[PDB]
């Protein structure tokens, strides 16, 4: 049975300890792999793939335009097309119109979007192969107009890339496919290799080694950034007495099954919830799951929290800062304004996280560990830089210049002042 707490019973210290996650040192493990791929390129990459993935490969990088359109069972194709369609739509909707701002006459300022020229997209292939993720990452990259898009994916035992992953890659305009995983893949993209293009930003979810390699390389001389630490999946469910216990259980197990590293949280809000029934459903449903062993392992670090009301429930959720939040309560939409920290939100009774994981259109590459306090999930803007642009007329510089001179004086920065003064003297003549 899942561990239980009551919020009023807890000291500040006990409460704050509930923010902690199950898994971890990783830098120590991962650093030598990164440096080795930095120094030795494709050769090291192949070796790392042999070691962990138990696959020997000579061609680790394929141009996607060279590879044939894979053939898919048509129900599978139809499903991934619905997903592509919904994700495309949700992300295309995020294009901001670039309005000029002119608050002083002759002082024109603006923002313009430019795509990151090359990006690397890590698509997990460990305990489960995730073409959903390929759509989550490649679709917004396609919309952004990124010129080089390298998608990394560790191969299957027979040396092959999952055909659903290749389908999505082609549909979203991925240019290069890196048949590699883990920290060796992340390092190959960050540094470039003989065959792998060097990227400017690395995206995507992964295991703790992938995640730690991402975190390391952002500080390296490779000159690379990342989206976020998007590690082991989490879900927090808030349920009231109207929620159907079996659906709640199903929802908790939907992400528990990802891995033993996952963490799940049930917040019971108000009176009237048959916690026993929920518990009975979790055990019942868990033991019939192919991945019930992983799920049970994940459940072992999961917990139930009882909250006197919905404001208290959502207040706790905000402290925990879950990757995913399912609000299964009466009038769930009305509580939306109290949500502060959550990567993605599922409101109501007909909105299992699964729809967001796969095809509602939102992005499932979301921050874990509590990183939802300051990071957003992947979005169109994750692939863009906003360059600010300004242009002054003579009149404009006559109006604004003297104030800039005053402020430069205050800061003790005479050259800053002179660049204005020199121009205003020239205008005077």
Ligand X SMILES: N[C@@H](Cc1c[nH]c[nH+]1)C(=O)O
As annotated, the active-site residues are 323-324
Neighbours of 360 (CB within 10 A): 18
Q: Alpha-carbon distance 144 to 148, whole Å?
A: 11
Task: Examine residue 251 and tell whether it contacts Zn ion (CB under 5 A).
Answer: no
d(CA 280, CA 270): 20
Among 268, 316, 357, 417, binds Zn ion (CB under 5 A): 357
Q: Which long-range contacts (CB under 8 A, 24 or more apart) does 141-146 make?
A: 141/172, 141/173, 141/174, 141/383, 142/172, 142/173, 143/88, 143/91, 143/92, 143/95, 143/380, 143/383, 144/115, 144/116, 144/380, 144/383, 144/384, 145/115, 146/115, 146/116, 146/117, 146/118, 146/119, 146/383
Shortest Å, Cβ 142 to ligand NAD: 19
Does 205 engage in binding with ligand NAD (CB under 6 A)? yes
Q: Is 231 annotated as a binding residue?
A: yes
State yes or no: residue 324 binds ligand NAD (CB under 6 A). Answer: no
Stretch that binds ligand X, among 15-23, 149-157, 296-304, 410-418 (CB under 6 A): 410-418
251 counts as binding ligand X under rule CB under 6 A = no
Cα dist. 124→155, 159, 231 in Å? 10, 16, 11
Backbone torsions φ then ψ of 89, nearest 5 degrees: -60, -45
Strand 201-203's sheet: what is its strand order?
Answer: 61-63, 176-178, 148-152, 118-122, 201-203, 225-226
67, interface contact from ligand X, Zn ion, ligand NAD, none, CB < 5-8 Å by kind: none
Distance CA 76, CA 74 (A): 5
Shortest Cβ 47–ligand X spacing (Å): 29
List binders of a copy of itself among 232-261 (CB under 8 A). 244, 246-247, 250-251, 253-258
Rounded (10°) CA dihedral 366, 367, 369, 370: -120
Query: Which is nearer to a copy of itself, 54 or 99 (by Cβ)?
Result: 99
Cβ distance to ligand NAD smaller for residue 183 or 273: 183
Nearer CB in complex with ligand NAD: 185/310 = 185
Q: Which of 55, 178, 186, 342 binds a copy of itself (CB under 8 A)?
A: 342
Question: What length is written for the chain?
Answer: 429
The gap from C-alpha 234 to its chain's centroid, in whole angstroms, comes to 13
Q: From a copy of itself, Zn ion, ligand NAD, none, which one binds at residue 419 (CB under 5 to 8 Å depending on kind)?
A: a copy of itself
**Residue 52 is labelled as binding a ligand:** yes
Distance in Å, CB of 372 to ligand NAD, minimum: 10
Check whether 344 is labelled as a binding-site residue.
no
Please list, residue by residue across 114-139, b when 16 or more beta carbons sit within 10 angstroms of its beta carbon and e when fewer do: ebbebbbbbbbbbeebbbbbbbbbbb
253-272: contacts with ligand NAD (CB under 6 A)? 258-259, 261-262
Residue 411's binding partner among ligand X, Zn ion, ligand NAD, none (Cβ under 5 to 8 angstroms by kind) is ligand X
Residues found near ligand X in the complex (CB under 6 A): 130, 132-133, 205, 233, 255, 323, 357, 364, 366, 411, 413, 416
Site residues (CB under 6 A) for ligand NAD?
A: 29, 52-53, 124-128, 130, 133, 154, 181-183, 205-207, 209-210, 230-233, 258-259, 261-262, 323, 364-366, 368
Q: Annotated binding residues, as ranges?
A: 52-53, 122, 125-127, 184, 207, 231, 233, 255, 258, 324, 357, 366, 411, 416
Annotated binding-site residues for Zn(2+) read: 255, 258, 357, 416
């Amino acid at each position: 049975p899942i561990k239980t707490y009551h919020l009023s019973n807890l000291t500040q210290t006990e409460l704050l300890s509930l923010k902690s996650r199950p898994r971890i040192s990783v830098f120590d493990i991962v650093n030598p792999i990164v440096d080795d791929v930095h120094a030795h390129g494709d050769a090291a990459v192949k070796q790392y793939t042999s070691k962990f993935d138990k696959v020997d490969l000579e061609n680790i990088v394929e141009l996607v335009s060279d590879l044939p359109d894979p053939v898919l069972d048509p129900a599978i194709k139809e499903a991934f097309d619905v997903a592509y369609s919904n994700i495309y739509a949700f992300h295309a909707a995020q294009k901001s119109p670039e309005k000029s701002v002119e608050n002083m006459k002759g002082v024109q300022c603006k923002r313009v979007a430019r795509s990151i020229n090359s990006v690397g997209l890590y698509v997990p292939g460990g305990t489960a192969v995730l073409p959903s993720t390929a759509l989550m990452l490649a679709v917004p990259a396609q919309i952004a107009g990124c010129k080089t898009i390298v998608l990394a994916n560790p191969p299957t035992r027979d040396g092959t890339t999952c055909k659903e992953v290749l389908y999505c890659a082609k549909k979203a305009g991925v240019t290069h496919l890196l048949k590699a995983g883990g920290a060796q893949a992340i390092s190959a993209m960050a540094w470039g290799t003989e065959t792998c293009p060097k990227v400017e930003k690395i995206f995507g979810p992964g295991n703790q080694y992938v995640t730690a390699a991402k975190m390391i390389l952002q500080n390296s001389e490779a000159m690379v950034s990342i989206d976020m630490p998007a590690g082991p999946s989490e879900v927090l469910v808030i349920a009231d007495k109207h929620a159907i216990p079996s659906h709640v259980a199903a929802d908790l197990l939907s992400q528990a099954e990802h891995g033993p590293d996952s963490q799940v949280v049930l917040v019971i809000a108000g009176d009237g919830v048959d916690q026993n029934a929920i518990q009975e459903e979790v055990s019942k449903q868990c033991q019939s799951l192919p991945r019930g062993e992983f799920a049970a392992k994940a459940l072992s670090h999961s917990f139930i929290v009882h909250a006197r009301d919905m404001l208290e429930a959502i207040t706790f959720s905000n402290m925990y800062a879950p990757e995913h939040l399912i609000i299964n309560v009466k009038d769930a939409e009305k509580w939306e304004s109290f949500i502060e920290n959550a990567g993605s939100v599922f409101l109501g009774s007909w909105t299992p996280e699964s729809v967001g994981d796969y095809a509602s259109g939102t992005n499932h590459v979301l921050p874990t560990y509590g990183y939802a306090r300051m990071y957003s999930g992947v979005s169109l803007d994750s692939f863009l830089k906003y360059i600010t642009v300004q242009s002054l007329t003579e009149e404009g510089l006559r109006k604004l210049g003297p104030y800039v001179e005053t402020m430069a004086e205050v800061e003790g920065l005479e050259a800053h002042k002179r660049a204005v003064t020199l121009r205003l003297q020239d205008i005077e003549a």
